Amino acid sequence: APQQINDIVHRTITPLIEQQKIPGMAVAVIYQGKPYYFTWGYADIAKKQPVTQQTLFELGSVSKTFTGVLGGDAIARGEIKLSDPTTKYWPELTAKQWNGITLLHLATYTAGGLPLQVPDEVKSSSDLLRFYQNWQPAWAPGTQRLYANSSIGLFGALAVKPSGLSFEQAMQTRVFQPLKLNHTWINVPPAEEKNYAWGYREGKAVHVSPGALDAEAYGVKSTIEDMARWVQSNLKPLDINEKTLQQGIQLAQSRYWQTGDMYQGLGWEMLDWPVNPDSIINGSDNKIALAARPVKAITPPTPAVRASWVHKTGATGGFGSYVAFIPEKELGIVMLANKNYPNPARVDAAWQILNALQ
Ligand SMILES: *C(=O)[C@@H](NC(=O)c1c(-c2ccccc2)noc1C)[C@@H]1N[C@@H](C(=O)O)C(C)(C)S1
């Protein structure tokens, strides 16, 4: 790294680790397009295994960025349209409240109040159908945003149906492989288990539990190198050789809805750059992140704006992640930690680094 990058990163992240008691962390900065890596602490505290550039972390809800791009790619292939009713792709979904709810609504949390989590009691396919059939919207579609794993997760499952591929197979063949993300996984293979960090929640080593629509909402695991490659791809989609994938990246960074200073993409969320750091820092707090917020439709959606702060936070019980990038500046960061610590501390650290380098 240039010494400048080294210093800004270390003088930001070292205190963050100390204050939040994070056991292990990995950071990548993308600066003028090139990645620089940094690692601290432990992947496995009991086995004294350090964090390396090969360590897998649970991305949690950052997974949604992959789901949003995979959907984008399906739209670009002509397999699905965001304007399609949900019922086109799940004809068993006959309940009247679904009339008017499109794939766009599912993808952008605007279906009318689908809940944050799919209930833990949903264990099978018929349980899932029952859940969505019996869900009662609080709101008309396209009026309020309520962040929901059950919303984007269903989008993900539906989006891959016409391909005939499972979500995991579609993701591997259409996103991970073409982008050379060869250490990024929905299900960690045995060959990579020795690199799979433990997450830490109240001092206990934990991994994410199986759950309905986990793959689509929160189930990706990846290394700091692959995630830097993911930032590079989203920074410069027009360099990707796969046509539909290049377009799906763009579509995921299109602005569909606005609530305050924030625009909703497919998975990604965006703000105009330059950004007021109090907008993003405080906005990342979960009482704000997860609130019911009225949205304004952006009619038609604005294509990916290069002058944007594009970002996503994620957590599992044992991990905390953050990704942000600024396409106009060829600049981005990935922060992966094996403790779930507050979003505002992530975003503050990220902005401190990127603002210094900008
Ligand atoms: C994605 O990261 C989602 N995470 C979870 O639903 C989740 C949690 C959790 C942590 C904190 C509060 C509620 C749930 N534990 O295990 C899982 C699988 C959602 N996105 C996050 C984000 O940062 O956008 C949250 C914290 C808003 S929940």
Swiss-Prot record:
Localisation per UniProt entry: Periplasm
Residues bound to a beta-lactam: 61, 117, 147, 149, 315, 340
Known outcome of mutating residue 149 to D/H: Lowers activity more than 1000-fold
Molecular function terms from GO: beta-lactamase activity
Outcome following mutation: residue 216 to K: Increases activity about 150-fold with respect to cefotaxime. Reduces activity about 5-fold with respect to cephalothin. Reduces thermodynamic stability
Primary localization: periplasm
Record-linked InterPro entries: Bact_CellWall_Synth/Modif (IPR050491), Beta-lactam-related (IPR001466), Beta-lactam/transpept-like (IPR012338), Beta-lactam_class-C_AS (IPR001586)
Cellular compartments per GO CC: outer membrane-bounded periplasmic space
Impact when changing residue 290 to A: Reduces binding affinity of inhibitor compound 3 about 30-fold
Enzyme class (EC, first level): hydrolase
Entry keyword annotation includes Amino-acid biosynthesis: no
Regulation: Inhibited by the beta-lactamase-blocking agents avibactam, enmetazobactam, relebactam, nacubactam, vaborbactam, taniborbactam, zidebactam, and beta-lactam-analog boronic acids, via a covalent binding to Ser-61. Inhibited by non-beta-lactam, benzo(b)thiophene-2-boronic acid (BZBTH2B) and various cyclic boronates. Not inhibited by clavulanic acid. Inhibited by O-aryloxycarbonyl hydroxamates, via cross-linking of the active site Ser-61 to Lys-312. Weakly inhibited by citric acid.
EC number: 3.5.2.6
Keywords from the UniProt entry: Antibiotic resistance, Hydrolase, Periplasm, Signal
Pfam families xref list: Beta-lactamase
Catalytic activity: a beta-lactam + H2O = a substituted beta-amino acid
Family to which the UniProt record says this protein belongs: Belongs to the class-C beta-lactamase family.
Role: Class C beta-lactamase which confers resistance to penicillins and cephalosporins. Has benzylpenicillin- and cephaloridine-hydrolyzing activity. Has weak cefuroxime, cefotaxime, cefoxitin and oxacillin-hydrolyzing activities.
More about this protein: The class C beta-lactamase family has a specific amino-acid numbering system known as SANC, for structural alignment-based numbering of class C beta-lactamases, or else the simpler name structural position. A multiple sequence alignment was used to derive a consensus sequence and then the consensus was numbered taking into account insertions and deletions. This allows use of identical numbers, e.g. for active site residues, despite differences in protein length.
Subunit and interaction comment: Monomer.
NCBIfam families linked: bla_class_C, BlaEC, CMY2-MIR-ACT-EC
Official protein name in the record: Beta-lactamase
Species, as recorded: Escherichia coli (strain K12)
Gene name per UniProt: ampC
